[PDB]
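Title: Request for sanity check on AN1-type zinc finger protein 1 prediction

Description:
We are preparing a figure and want to confirm that the structure record we downloaded matches what your pipeline produces today. Could someone re-run it with the sequence below and paste the raw structure tokens into this thread? We only need the token string, no images.
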Amino acid sequence: GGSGAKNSETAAKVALMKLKMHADGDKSLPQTERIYFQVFLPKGSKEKSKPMFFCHRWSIGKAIDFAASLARLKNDNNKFTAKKLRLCHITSGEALPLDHTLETWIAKEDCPLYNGGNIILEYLNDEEQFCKNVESYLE
């Protein structure tokens, strides 16, 4: 990278390395529009949490397909009549719209979200849209 401002900018930089320090990646990444989020494991392995950042600001359809990969689970997002791991909103349960874009949600006035937020990963049919009890989402 390369930039100098301090005072305010430092607030974002210090916060970036803070999370990235635990996540899987170098604090100094090329993607300037990259995004960071905590991937809450489905709770069923040796690890409890699995942080990771990526410029998945694109369509949500790609996020899901990617989640299955990062989570090291089975998937395909094409020809499968089973349950797939999707990305839901934190403290909400609302499953991200696969037929929409992530940026749209960030610019949304009703839900002005941005990088640095939390995300949940659970096996939910593509037909789904909103999940209940974010805590018992996996039960």
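Thanks, this matches our download. The domain at 30-123 is CATH 3.10.20.90 (Ubiquitin-like (UB roll)).
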